[PDB]
Amino acid sequence: MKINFSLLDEPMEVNLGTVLVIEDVSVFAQLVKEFYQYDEQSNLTIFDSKIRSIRSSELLLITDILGYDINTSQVLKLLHTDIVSQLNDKPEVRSEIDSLVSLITDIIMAECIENELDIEYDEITLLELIKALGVRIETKSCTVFEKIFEILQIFKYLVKKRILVFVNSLSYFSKDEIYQILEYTKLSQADVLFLEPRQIEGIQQFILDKDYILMPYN
Amino acid sequence: MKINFSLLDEPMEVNLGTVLVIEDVSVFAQLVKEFYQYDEQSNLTIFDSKIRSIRSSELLLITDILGYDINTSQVLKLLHTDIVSQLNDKPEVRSEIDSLVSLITDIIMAECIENELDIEYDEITLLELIKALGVRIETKSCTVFEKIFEILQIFKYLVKKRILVFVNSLSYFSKDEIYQILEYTKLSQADVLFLEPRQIEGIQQFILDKDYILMPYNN
Amino acid sequence: MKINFSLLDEPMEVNLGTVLVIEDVSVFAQLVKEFYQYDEQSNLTIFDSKIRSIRSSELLLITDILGYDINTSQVLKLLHTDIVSQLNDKPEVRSEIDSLVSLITDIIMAECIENELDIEYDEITLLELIKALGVRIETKSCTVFEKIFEILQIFKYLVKKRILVFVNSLSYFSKDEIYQILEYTKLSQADVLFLEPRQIEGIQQFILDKDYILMPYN
Amino acid sequence: MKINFSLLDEPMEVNLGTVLVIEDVSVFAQLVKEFYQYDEQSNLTIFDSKIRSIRSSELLLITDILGYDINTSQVLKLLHTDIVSQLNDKPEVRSEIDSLVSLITDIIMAECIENELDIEYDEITLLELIKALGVRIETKSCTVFEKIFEILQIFKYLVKKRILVFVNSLSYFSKDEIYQILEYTKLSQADVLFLEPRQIEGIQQFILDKDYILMPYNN
Amino acid sequence: MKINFSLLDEPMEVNLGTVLVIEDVSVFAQLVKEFYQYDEQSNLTIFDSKIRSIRSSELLLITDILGYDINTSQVLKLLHTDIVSQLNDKPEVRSEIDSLVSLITDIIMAECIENELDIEYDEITLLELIKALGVRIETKSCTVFEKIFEILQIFKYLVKKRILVFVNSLSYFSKDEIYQILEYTKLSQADVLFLEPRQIEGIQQFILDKDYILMPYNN
Amino acid sequence: MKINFSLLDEPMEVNLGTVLVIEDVSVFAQLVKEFYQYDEQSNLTIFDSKIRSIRSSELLLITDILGYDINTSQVLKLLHTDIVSQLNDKPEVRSEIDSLVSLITDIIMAECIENELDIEYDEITLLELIKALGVRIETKSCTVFEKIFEILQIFKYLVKKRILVFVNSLSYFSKDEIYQILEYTKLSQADVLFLEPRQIEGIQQFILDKDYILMPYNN
Amino acid sequence: MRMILMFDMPTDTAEERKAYRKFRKFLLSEGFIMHQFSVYSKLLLNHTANTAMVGRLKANNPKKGNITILTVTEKQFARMIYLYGEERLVFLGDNY
Amino acid sequence: MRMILMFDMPTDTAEERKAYRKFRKFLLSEGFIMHQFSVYSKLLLNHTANTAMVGRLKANNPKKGNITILTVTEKQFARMIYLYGEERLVFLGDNY
Amino acid sequence: MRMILMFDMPTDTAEERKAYRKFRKFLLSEGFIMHQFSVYSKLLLNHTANTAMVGRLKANNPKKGNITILTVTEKQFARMIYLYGEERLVFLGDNY
Amino acid sequence: MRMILMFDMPTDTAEERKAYRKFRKFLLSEGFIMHQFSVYSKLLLNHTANTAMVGRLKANNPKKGNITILTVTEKQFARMIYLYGEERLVFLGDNY
Ligand SMILES: [Ca+2]
Ligand SMILES: [Ca+2]
Ligand SMILES: [Ca+2]
Ligand SMILES: [Ca+2]
Ligand SMILES: [Ca+2]
Ligand SMILES: [Ca+2]
Ligand SMILES: [Ca+2]
Ligand SMILES: [Ca+2]
């Protein structure tokens, strides 16, 4: 994947982990504004290997790592649908689940018939059992280093998002933690792009000078 | 639970079921209008043994039997709690249900471990199983008699309603059905007050003559 | 309009005001059950002058007169749309309304520009002006005799409802008030059908005997 | 409004804008984690002059500037009330608006009298006119600087938030923009605390060395 | 108002006065101890028609008749309000009292004008006149029967007490006095539950045999 | 914490100590009367950064320094809690106190065992030891300067008071004592507003001329 | 819209009496009629003239003056009962 | 039924002032609230209480006293607006 | 699911001691291991054997007996620190 | 971090009982609550307070005293279940 803006001479490719440093505060703030306004503004463009423009729905932009909720309505919907598909791939297990649900429905139905008030029921479904169990991704994160790892896991799980972008998220992690994040990104194959106001020493990064010239580093 | 109006000489007590028959259409319509407007009008006064006047929120007024909605969030919630208590009173049934939902939890847990993402859960409870089953009262196919009976059954579930009042609801039910309604009201202990223009034969009721004289009547 | 059930030999026509007395409590309660369940049960039928069955949406069934709210979402929607149509029928008046709304929008816009915080607005519409004014039918009813008159007015205003039905609603009104209700029904031309457990003296009504035979009265 | 952590010897006071620079990435990340988890962790303690510890509901934490939603029901409601007060401070403008809304009410009233049904209404007020206009803040085309400025403007509208805190928000703004933010914060009187890994040149700030020594710095 | 204990097969209803006779001294003493400790112990459960369990603050327990204090701030206050209502129901008496109070206020006002200092006052009301009179119930010379009768009269004045219970209070009263107490309880509508070790002859009561069998008894 | 009156062009902010000098006796007396009557009068308006107007209960007004009572139930209670916290911050001292209290409890327990009656107790705590010691502030021998200093020390203990205001209190203190009061107020962070008819030389203050012009003054 | 207006103010001072006369003359010039002392009413054509009249009345109110304003229907205006300060035969029934 | 009541009477004599104080105290005792001088209102439950109140007011009216009674709806009673206070030469200062 | 179980009861009565021995033998027969006095643990395969085991433990609890149950992960179980009852050289740093 | 703590020790000697009372009072003073005999728990804010608490518990452990420490999550600490109490011949009566 490649990103292109009017400041660059040629579009630079983003593969696996990528660190982009902008030495101009105006170009950095205007670039983040172009990231949040990407749907509104046509200046900033992104061309994949197919050389096709992507909608903002396919771009995942995350600034605050701790403030980003892992559990969402769409994420829980895709997770519950995934578990329902896994249970549907095995006929015998789903048959046993239908038998147990039939037994529980028979017991609760008998208790309802024992009551003096009329009771009407419909049925119990596997999706209602998963939602009743509260299946969700683990919400336990001790540090931002683990939270960003969970963000990379959920990002690699989401097929619709073709790119994940972090804005000034590298200032929290130590150099060694940055090395572990880069190695985990290379192992996960996902495309991650970082935007930093200042350069980081010891790691390979693309430095954008105030002259607008882009140069590789390490 | 005594109710009083300007037409009555002394406040009349309402215990269990009470059938109040108003032979005058003017006083009956005025009394029903005072029942709907009760918060606005000071003429009709309903007080308990403490002499404290009950609020209109504590008063439950019912005219259309089939048009009233018996299914509410509080009624269904307290009903699910009652079913959970009924299942909790039997140790064996609760143990079996714990075994079944237990096995289901084992299966779903295995399916979660098979996934690549780290997944956490808590439990599948009995109240969540009842809410997933969608237990509710069925008024769709119910006859008017069964509807009023279900209303008398859910009146115990309503916490805020102090007294239930029915307006001209005794015209639909046969004498035997009225006997069943009263005999069930004596067991339910709830306070029900019926208002009818014409007197019902065979049941004890309070009659208000066109002379504005209130008399007890056995038939 | 005519109504037909298995108990009647031939379907009886309901024109202007009609009083139907059922001398059997089981047939009366079962008839009201057939009225509320009319969508579910096919026993009770209604055939208009076109001899075409009507859906339950076209049937207006009202039991409690005081408990029936005159103001509803659909009623207020049709009323606001009607007033919007009346204002749209006159181009000059609507033009003046657009001018005044433009002046108010200019004043409030100037006050918004005077503020130090950025403010974004859309526009003001005639429907938002009617809903802001709270246009609704009069909710003042002193007695059930007036409330039933308002029910007849709103029923005559509603084109979708082909019939209005009252269940045991004649016990509240005096004989003279019943005469005024019948005369108002004949003047309004609307189709109203009453269901009473016992017969009323002094007025014309159809008496259904316990033998199931139907006979005219007065 | 003093904040205290185990690293500091004494609680540091936060008045108007305050720029806190932590040169250690471990202490900075741990402090930010203690800012998000503040209700759970007892290490970071923020108290007012009364020494009473403020709840996490009273604390306002902000990291993403453009991702935060500035438009809320309470903010828009209090903003509409502020606009109504601004229109009420001028008698002439209020009189003119009353005249215009009066004319519109006359027209709509005539249209209601032309109808066959009996129609009643009450009034068209100024708050209803503003709510019909849909007055709200526009963050769509706003730059990050204007976004943070609007956040500093709406912080007075927020009643429950005791203190506003920004996490690494000073990296986007130029030195002059930071001077405008601080100079505006001195006028707004609000308590804002910025947390940056690197020190900003030209502004007064509190620097925490890798030695865990806190020192005031003019530049 | 139904009460239930482990010894009973079904919860027994308490309406108006109810005489409960426990023939076993062990079950009687254990039941009384469960009445004093009721908040601590879950064995004895008293619930209303709503099935809601009443708090010990709502329960009124009485053993010593002459040792109980009938005069309280709330009882005397509500009693003074009741007397003020009785004086307000009669227009002529209220007019005369207003005239006399007007005369006294005129005299005291003249005496205040005669003084050198500037003096201001407000009014002398009827509640202040009753509080100055010191109206209260006299239990000093009252017999035990008149004491229990006054307790049944002030139970309507107590707002928070849901049910009144007497422990072995029927031993002092003669059969005729018990008939007067029950007949008055039927008019007062209050819920009173008496607990006696021995059965009383001539009155309807619930008997609990040493076999732990509960049976209704006419005599 | 900004205060505003009709005489001022813009609302003036009060941060830490603030010396307000009113050169006009009429505006000064009217402003003090508006300070005592503040709940009744709408002329003087004091609001915080939230623009919310503070109640008179939140406002603390002080004129007589030696006549004010510094010892209150809440002040002494919170002070005893502060002393208990100071003793809790030191583990060794708390351990020694626990040892001594254990010895005394052993002695008293032996004396209780020697008695014929069965006796039970619970514990002797540190707060009970401080309450038994009768720790309180001594204003009897205190000079006016030490009294105002103790008032500035206990203002942090008062939870409900939003702002402290002194009326003509700067006439007693020497310039150096005023410098100590202001320098201590800057450390205490409390909001104090002094009102004086005449300007004090050497301290920063806001001066209101007879022309009704408000100007900052360094001396 | 029937506008009922009550007017009051301390009359003790001469300036207060002059202001009262001026305000009363202003009320008469605006179309208001005095039914009794402090009692006045005027028929407003619509809500527009009512609002403008409210603004004008607020502008013309004298110092310490106090005005009460009430909106009343014609049926309520005809039901207005003014009593300015004992029947031998009392008839409950048709009045003959 | 919202009852608006205006009250006026010559106050010159001492007996007239005493009668005015007595009538005002009677109005306050009956549930009426004074919005301003001569201006009062009370909320009557129904038409019967309104008629009885009219008879009582006629009975308690002092000599030379004049009372104006107007019926207004409760919503119209809340609509009551109380206003409390074009010149070429404006003088701020001594009025000369 | 790692099930940590604490067990206690008054041991004064002889039948209480017998019941304590019986309950301990029942815990050993069910797969629980005693780490120390009153301290036991067992590894439950899933929430199934966990719920069933809770029911069984409630059924087998002796009179006046009291059992505390806690659910713990393997990482938390390995972090269990048991101390069974003053250093001259204190080292803050690498422990060498 | 939820700290579950079990405490046992031979109670036979009087000195051992006194040491048990002292250690229990020390546990109560440190914030630990006794769910049952030998069964206690306390909520530790973080890992540092947990380590310091471990050192303090090791320092305050009585002679022959034995303490079992287990870490459980706060949600798992709430999951703590306390249960308080197959025969062919059931005897209701004298046990013979
Ligand atoms: Ca769950
Ligand atoms: Ca379902
Ligand atoms: Ca709009
Ligand atoms: Ca409106
Ligand atoms: Ca008084
Ligand atoms: Ca006295
Ligand atoms: Ca103690
Ligand atoms: Ca002492």
- The CATH number for B64's domain is 3.40.50.11940
Distance in angstroms (rounded) separating the CA atoms of residues E166 and E171:
11
**Chain F contact for D15 (CB, 8 A cutoff):** yes
Q: Are residues E126 and E151 in the same domain?
A: no
Q: List the structure tokens of E39.
A: 């908040």
SS3 A48: coil
Q: Determine whether the interchain pair G55/D103 forms a contact, defined as Cβ–Cβ distance below 8 Å.
A: no
Residues of chain I with C-beta less than 8 angstroms from the C-beta of B92: none
D13 is in an annotated binding site: no
Q: Are residues D193 and D127 in the same domain?
A: no
CA E89 to ligand 5 centroid distance, Å: 22
Among F85, F109, F134, identify where a domain stops.
Answer: F134
CB-based contacts of B124, cutoff 8 Å, min separation 6: A129, A132, A133, B101, B104, B105
Query: Backbone phi, then psi, for E194, in 5-degree steps?
Result: -100, 140
**Chain B contact for H29 (CB, 8 A cutoff):** no
Please check whether residue D218 is in contact with residue D21, taking contact to mean a CB–CB distance below 8 angstroms: no
**Chain E contact for B50 (CB, 8 A cutoff):** yes
Q: Identify the burial level of B34 via C-beta atoms within 10 angstroms of its C-beta, where 0-12 means exposed, 13-18 middle and 19 or more buried.
A: middle
Instruction: Verify C-D touch: 3 or more CB pairs within 8 A.
Output: yes
Q: List the structure tokens of A54.
A: 């992507």
Chain-centroid distance, C-alpha J81: 15
For residue C26, give the nearest of B30, B66, B174 by CB distance.
B174
Q: Are residues D90 and D123 in the same domain?
A: yes
- Name the minimum distance, in Å, from the CA of H2 to any CA of chain G: 10
Among B115, B134, B153, identify where a domain stops.
Answer: B134
Taking Cα atoms as reference points, which of A118, C103, C36, A69 lies closest to residue D93? C103
CA E101 to ligand 6 centroid distance, Å: 16
Residues of chain G with C-beta less than 8 angstroms from the C-beta of D103: 48
**Interface contacts (B, I; CB < 8 Å):** 27
- Name the minimum distance, in Å, from the CA of A169 to any CA of chain D: 9
CATH number of the domain bearing residue A84: 6.10.250.2340
The protein residues having their C-beta less than 5 angstroms from ligand 6 (an ion) are E 134
Q: List the structure tokens of D125.
A: 């007020």
Distance in angstroms (rounded) separating the CA atoms of residues A109 and B87:
11
For residue I67, give the nearest of J61, J64, J83 by CB distance.
J83
Q: Are residues B214 and B158 in the same domain?
A: yes
Q: List the structure tokens of B192.
A: 């029900």
- Domain count of chain A? 2
Interface test with B, best of I1, I44, I45, I51 (most B CBs within 10 A): I51
Instruction: Verify D-J touch: 3 or more CB pairs within 8 A.
Output: yes
SS3 F7: coil
List Cα–Cα distances, E127 to C137, D72, E86, E124, in angstroms. Answer: 48, 52, 12, 9
The protein residues having their C-beta less than 5 angstroms from ligand 4 (an ion) are C 134; D 122
For residue F184, give the amino acid letter. Answer: Y
Q: List the structure tokens of B127.
A: 């109240």
Q: List the structure tokens of G67.
A: 């005005």
Contacts 24+ apart (CB under 8 A), F76-81: F76/F135, F76/F136, F78/F157, F78/F159, F79/F135, F79/F137, F79/F154, F79/F157, F80/F127, F80/F130, F80/F131, F80/F135, F81/F127
The protein residues having their C-beta less than 5 angstroms from ligand 8 (an ion) are F 134
Distance in angstroms (rounded) separating the CA atoms of residues D146 and D184:
12
DSSP string, F29-80: HHHHHHHHSTTT-SSSEEE-TT-PBPPTTTEEEE--TTTS----HHHHHHHH
Distance in angstroms (rounded) separating the CA atoms of residues H55 and E184:
42
Distance in angstroms (rounded) separating the CA atoms of residues A212 and B57:
72
Resolution at which this structure was determined, Å: 8.9
- Name the minimum distance, in Å, from the CA of E121 to any CA of chain B: 34
Q: Determine whether the interchain pair F156/D50 forms a contact, defined as Cβ–Cβ distance below 8 Å.
A: yes
Q: Are residues B142 and B214 in the same domain?
A: yes
CA B102 to ligand 1 centroid distance, Å: 13
Distance in angstroms (rounded) separating the CA atoms of residues D141 and D131:
22
Taking Cα atoms as reference points, which of G45, G70, C128 lies closest to residue D103? G45
Taking Cα atoms as reference points, which of B29, D112, D117, D114 lies closest to residue C150? D117
Q: Are residues A123 and A152 in the same domain?
A: no
Instruction: Verify G-J touch: 3 or more CB pairs within 8 A.
Output: no
CA A91 to ligand 2 centroid distance, Å: 21
What single DSSP character describes residue I94?
Answer: -
Please check whether residue B141 is in contact with residue B60, taking contact to mean a CB–CB distance below 8 angstroms: no
Q: Are residues C55 and C163 in the same domain?
A: yes
Instruction: Verify I-F touch: 3 or more CB pairs within 8 A.
Output: no
Q: Are residues C44 and C121 in the same domain?
A: no
Distance in angstroms (rounded) separating the CA atoms of residues C190 and C117:
58
Chains with 3+ CB–CB pairs under 8 A to J are D, I
Distance separating the N- and C-terminal Cα atoms of chain I: 37
CA B71 to ligand 1 centroid distance, Å: 24
For residue C100, give the nearest of D100, D111, D120 by CB distance.
D100
Residues of chain H with C-beta less than 8 angstroms from the C-beta of G73: 73
Q: Could you identify the residue written with the tokens 């249960």?
A: J83
What single DSSP character describes residue E170?
Answer: T
F50 lies in which domain range?
1-72+135-218
Q: How many residues are recorded in chain D?
A: 219
For residue B189, give the nearest of E13, E188, E190 by CB distance.
E13
Taking Cα atoms as reference points, which of F48, F20, F6 lies closest to residue F203? F20
**Chain A contact for D66 (CB, 8 A cutoff):** yes
Q: Are residues D28 and D128 in the same domain?
A: no
Judged by its nearest atom, the ligand closest to the C-alpha of residue E127 is: 5
Query: Backbone phi, then psi, for I43, in 5-degree steps?
Result: -95, 115
List Cα–Cα distances, C22 to B145, C19, C29, C61, E37, in angstroms. Answer: 17, 10, 9, 17, 61
Q: Could you identify the residue written with the tokens 């300070």?
A: F35
CA E129 to ligand 6 centroid distance, Å: 9
Q: List the structure tokens of F17.
A: 């100590």
Name the β-bridge partners of B206.
Answer: B20, B216
Query: How many CA atoms within 13 Å lie on the side-chain side of F103?
Result: 5
Please check whether residue A5 is in contact with residue A31, taking contact to mean a CB–CB distance below 8 angstroms: yes
Among B90, B107, B134, identify where a domain stops.
Answer: B134
**Chain G contact for H71 (CB, 8 A cutoff):** yes
For residue A188, give the amino acid letter. Answer: S
The H-or-E segment that residue C196 falls in is strand C192-196
Method used for this model?
A: cryo-EM
List Cα–Cα distances, B171 to A73, B178, C161, D190, in angstroms. Answer: 52, 10, 27, 70
Rounded to the nearest 10 degrees, the angle between the axes of helix A91-114 and helix B91-114 is: 150
- Name the minimum distance, in Å, from the CA of D110 to any CA of chain A: 45
Distance in angstroms (rounded) separating the CA atoms of residues C153 and C148:
9
Name the β-bridge partners of F22.
Answer: F208
Please check whether residue B13 is in contact with residue B51, taking contact to mean a CB–CB distance below 8 angstroms: no
Rounded to the nearest 10 degrees, the angle between the axes of helix E91-114 and helix E73-89 is: 110
Q: Are residues F61 and F77 in the same domain?
A: no
Please check whether residue B127 is in contact with residue B83, taking contact to mean a CB–CB distance below 8 angstroms: no
Query: How many CA atoms within 13 Å lie on the side-chain side of D43?
Result: 19
At residue C99's C-alpha, the angle toward residues C96 and C101, to 5°, is 110
CB-based contacts of H15, cutoff 8 Å, min separation 6: none
Q: Are residues F142 and F58 in the same domain?
A: yes
Distance in angstroms (rounded) separating the CA atoms of residues A157 and A153:
6
Chains with 3+ CB–CB pairs under 8 A to F are D
Taking Cα atoms as reference points, which of D142, D155, D178, D136 lies closest to residue D61? D155
- For the CA atoms of D37, D43, D48, D49, the dihedral, rounded to the nearest 10 degrees, stands at 180
Q: Are residues B106 and B88 in the same domain?
A: yes
The protein residues having their C-beta less than 5 angstroms from ligand 2 (an ion) are A 122; B 134
Q: List the structure tokens of J57.
A: 């518990």
Residues of chain B with C-beta less than 8 angstroms from the C-beta of C70: none
